[PDB]
Design a protein around this ligand. Structure first.
Ligand SMILES: */C(=N\[C@@H](C[C@@H](*)C)C(=O)O)c1c(COP(=O)(O)O)cnc(C)c1O
Ligand SMILES: */C(=N\[C@@H](C[C@@H](*)C)C(=O)O)c1c(COP(=O)(O)O)cnc(C)c1O
Ligand SMILES: *[C@@H](C)C[C@H](/N=C/c1c(COP(=O)(O)O)cnc(C)c1O)C(=O)O
Ligand SMILES: *[C@@H](C)C[C@H](/N=C/c1c(COP(=O)(O)O)cnc(C)c1O)C(=O)O
Lengths: 393, 394, 394, 393
């Protein structure tokens, strides 16, 4: 029986330090000494194991990578210095001028901009579609289609996508890679490779680190493709090299990932249910609600329903600013997945970079408020909302 | 009068900490709290100053950036998580499928690969020329030429390039950006903008940090272009986001940059002179040599001659391995610019990724050794080469 | 109503950062700049707030201190660079040659040594008694008695001490300080001041940091006494100055203290129950057991029963070694309170420094094993003991 | 021939990391795993090498310790979490109630308080004398004398003490240890064991780290005494355990110690000479001046004259505040030995804790200004003083 996820966030990929250090040391070194020239030339040629230089690989970073690969059930993992770097190192390794990419239209704002404006200036063709509609992916495929990409639940509407149905369509022609951004679930909730996904990416800045003090990304997938991503996407094209110090903080944060995800999902269900019945609140989105579109798909793909909640007030945008400015426990900031509860307004903040018309076509409204529930006491979270919401009348 | 470089590497871009901290604290935070929504919306719309999220900006990272922009005399500076990321974020922001790039053919191995393989699969045209030769730049210019790129002294031959000349040729046509990789010199030795260069990049992993423990890059230039590089190159395309903890370490390392560069240059002159008169050595490339090509150019562009030394042994490849395997003080590893002296063999190590014929055309032979001298005692360094070299011969 | 402990370990003592940093920066600075001399002179004379020098105070260290003082319900808290430093700075500030100290005889090995050997060469009188036994405290009180000191549950037998009782006896004479080492419980399980305790110390190296990567101590109590401990115990006598980088890591670790203590206590109840019914096990000490001595006292003093479990194998010393050498998931090392489960053998390890007869008098036998349960899957933990224990027997 | 000091601040005590890390990794771990119980019990008994727990020892900390021991030419070194901790762990390991200590009266203010008030309440007898006067030490010895302690140059007057003469006197009776606080020189300037000193201490917060961001101390001396200091002074009495992260920063700072000390001493000579001829300045103290008392002893004991300068204005204390408040490059703060130049006023700042009468009996006046010169450009340092001093007229 496979080591459980609970035990594995601490003990997968055990390290062997020469002194028996309980916590493996931090390899804050840019470079590694060769014993002789032959060894150096063998490593550079890929003929001998061992380290060379921190943009190419680092033992502290590998420690984190093997733990994550295990938790995602993939052969390998490549760590980067930001979720965007993980995304970009992946798609810029795979694609070239002439290729085609299909993406869900509801994405993190910066990923949407990368696909709409950067890839298209490098000669890559992109389609933005609703990949939650059965059959939509297959309808937009062309012979040169190389990647189908999506986020579920989506940032920030929490739209659910049936991953297995998307993979069926994408893999109905040879040579297509399906990439899922699994940031909002984390590996404790979902393992996208279960459903046919080829590559899984994360902003490790969010739940995996969980402590709001590290910006970093992760790429999980087959070893041969990830070796290409490492030697092309990381080494030359993005240069998104994580600091070994930051990787060591993420391994530290990872050790409480299982207890954090459970506590945050439990609190989120209580908070979502509270929000739903407040008279000032118009609509609440939470994957665990039975009336949430794709709830049955969500239950199939997610072990817990997450700590992300998106909601709309009956007083709209102006209502959203008043509530948000008057919260006393919940913190006003972007990002998510930390131990403290955060909240923000996607149309003027995380998704302001996406043109309104594209926002709204994807279901992102100007009234939406996006909340990431931490591990505070749930009654005190509810009480902060009550006081803030009662003031709206 | 302008704050000298010797004071500025400690005191340029002074910070204001609320507690008066002598060393400004480490902002190891991914996100920043808004006082109210209007302020957050305003910061995202570029209408109000203040911070948002570390991929977009961070106060510790800005501290290092302002210090480097001052030292390079540029309006702005963008830090990244690797010298390659600085190069990539810069050229991927500027160019688009269909553009043309001119580069010196003698570059760091990974940059040459970035240019030869990655840029060309994205529809960019690239020519590798000898920009040190009068006329080559102007002859290769095309209507879609956007960038002229070079390193001087070059990695690893230490070829000197007349920057003023290259800039006048590149800028004889409108809309061309000249980009210089100033890593081997550091801002203490050269400020390439003095010669007309538009953008200056660095692998801050080398001399600037100077302690062999951080991988990071810097981009220095005008505010307009660097604001585009930050919003496109960093934010979307590379995601080469420097760690605030590493930026703080670079700032620490930067405070001794002036005394390290001086001490390393002084050592390097002694070591280069010793290598040049050793019977096992065919050739020594050092910018300080009076005979060497580009010496008057190197002298006009460099305040010090640097601590890089490249040399070729008369016994070739096999001789290089024997010497590098028997060195006891000098450290065998890639990288450079640290306090400890480092040495390596470019054809099988840093430049093994470049096809042999491109290596050979750029003067990278297989008898070539590259050395980065640190701040050890110069006599102990020369004695390590003496025992290593004598054994080769005897 | 008071902020709950579950919220307070993240949000008590909120900081105000000038940039709105969500995670307050690391003040890794030794010294602080004065705006003018008067201000500096005023801060040194205790007449003006603000910082001076990190041995004397530091904003990152104050952040952790205010968070812990809130969690323990004390006016103040002083952080140190080790649990021993917290103990030493406290007792070396209070006592002077000629004073008398009463301590429970069952203590952490190094504290017992500090007390038995160091304090006594400095002219302090020390008696080690069983403070869990009615009357022993009052019977040993002398006119010069300054301190009554204990740990509950005790390291490593987990003996429970009725704190309210000990305090009423100690405070039946004027001028006595009761000091409780609350490391095994953490502020999430017990607030010893609720029972009349004056000073609470911790090895923050254990549960509070909770990630096995920091050595640090805390002292919690009244502002008057802690101001003396900071100006004498820390500043001159121990020089146990915590690193701001480590304090920041402790603050990070503290944010999950509530969910870790709950998860570890829940696991520990399951693991203790399994050990108790295993035929190779003679005895299991766990505060949650309904039969065990001091259970109603433990229940009144502890919100949770903790994750420490101590047990004795019927095959004694040789059996303990075999079991500890064949465990595959539980980690053999000293320390405790981390996310990973740790185990060790007190008579040859943490308490080997205490003369055998003192160990034996305090109930530390050589068949005794101490376990600190972490947050792994409870069934995997029990399966590691099952294979280890079955092999012992078979 | 012994590795030079220049080379040794980088290369003494070379480490062997399993991956060949050029910069040895950071052992930020509180504890170490035993391979078996027997190994654990052997280490605890002092019968087997290897690590146990970070208050007892740590590989990153040992790296720093062996580099320092080499540079000081002592058998061993114990690192602590502050210079005061180094001092206290040493004297509290050696002494017991009934013992006697002789100290120079001109000391860092906090050391003076430790000796005057803490040791005396633990039954230790202390004499404060001018140890620069030939014969003074011997005159105050008693049968129970265990330690003779001093600082040279002294903080903050820069009084010079003939170490060899002090050691002769102290070692004229059996069982006496001479302890020198060598913070103001650093091991690049002086190695006190050359002159008979038994134990050398440092505030590594100053020059050795040299970057004003770490508080830490160092104890250098024979292995058997330092083993006692480690197992009693550090383990139980002070608990002054340095953070491995801070030890790794100090090894990093140490690598530029030789170039820093030379540049700071060179700048200091220029600054002291400038100050000396300014008409607003009454008196300048600098060990390199030929009229400095004990100049000949200083030349004998110091390879360079240091970067510390103490001076007095003809406008006294009020003059000192005006100059100090108007310096623009020099930084107003306590501490010293960093890359930036610092300045402070000892009577109201570092030595305010010492009663006036004791200050003045030791030569510390209310007019003294203490300056620690960094590596800025010397003309710009002089120019900051010129503008500040000219304003005093
Ligand atoms: C992280 N998104 C953030 C921050 C941008 C404002 C959020 O929505 O608040 C993110 C990323 C990019 O990862 P980073 O480069 O910021 O580490 C990638 N995927 C997802 C889903 C998100 O949310
Ligand atoms: C360091 N002294 C300082 C700081 C106190 C104000 C200075 O004079 O400004 C010092 C110490 C103590 O070392 P730390 O505990 O501060 O690391 C010990 N010896 C000397 C000579 C001094 O100066
Ligand atoms: C590669 C082996 C290391 C190194 N040169 C690096 C370097 C770069 C890239 O900087 P990063 O390694 O990504 O921080 C860019 N510019 C120059 C000139 C470099 O030398 C080598 O040892 O040569
Ligand atoms: C010693 C082997 C470690 C540990 N107990 C530590 C501890 C201390 C000391 O704290 P520090 O190790 O200096 O941070 C003080 N109080 C208690 C109760 C402790 O347990 C052990 O494994 O028992």
């Amino acid at each position: 029986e496979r080591m459980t996820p609970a035990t594995a966030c601490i003990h997968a990929n055990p390290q062997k330090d020469q002194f028996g250090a309980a916590i493996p040391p931090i390899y804050q070194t840019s470079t590694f000494v060769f014993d002789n020239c032959q060894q150096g030339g063998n490593r550079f040629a890929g003929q001998e194991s061992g380290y060379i230089y921190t943009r190419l690989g680092n033992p502290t970073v590998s420690n984190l990578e093997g733990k994550i690969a295990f938790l995602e059930k993939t052969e390998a993992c490549v760590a980067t210095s930001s979720g965007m770097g993980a995304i970009a190192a992946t798609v810029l390794t795979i694609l070239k001028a002439g290729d085609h990419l299909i993406s869900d239209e509801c994405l993190y704002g910066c990923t949407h901009a990368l696909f709409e404006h950067a890839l298209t200036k490098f000669g890559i063709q992109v389609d933005f579609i609703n990949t939650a509609i059965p059959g939509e992916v297959k309808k937009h495929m062309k012979p040169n289609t190389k990647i189908v990409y999506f986020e579920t639940p989506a940032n920030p509407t929490l739209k659910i996508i049936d991953m297995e149905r998307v993979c069926k369509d994408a893999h109905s022609q040879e040579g297509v890679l399906v990439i899922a951004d699994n940031t909002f679930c984390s590996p404790m909730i979902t393992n996208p490779v279960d459903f046919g996904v080829d590559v899984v990416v994360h902003s490790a800045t969010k739940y995996i680190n969980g402590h709001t003090d590290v910006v970093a990304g992760l790429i999980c997938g087959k070893a041969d493709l990830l070796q290409q991503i490492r030697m092309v996407g990381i080494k030359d094209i993005t240069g998104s090299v994580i600091s070994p110090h930051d990787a060591w903080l993420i391994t530290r944060g990872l050790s409480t990932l299982n207890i954090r995800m459970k506590a945050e999902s439990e609190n989120a269900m209580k908070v979502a249910e509270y929000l739903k019945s407040h008279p000032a609140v118009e609509k609440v989105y939470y994957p665990g609600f039975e009336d949430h579109e794709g709830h049955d798909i969500a239950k199939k793909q997610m072990r817990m329903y997450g700590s992300m909640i998106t909601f709309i007030l009956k007083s709209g945008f102006e209502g959203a600013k008043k509530l948000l400015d008057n919260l006393k426990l919940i913190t006003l900031a972007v990002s998510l997945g930390g131990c403290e509860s955060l909240i923000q307004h996607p149309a003027s903040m995380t998704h302001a970079v996406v043109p309104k018309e594209e926002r709204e076509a994807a279901g992102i409204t100007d009234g939406m408020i996006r909340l990431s529930v931490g591990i505070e006491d749930a009654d005190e979270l509810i009480a902060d909302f009550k006081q803030g919401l009662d003031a709206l009348l």
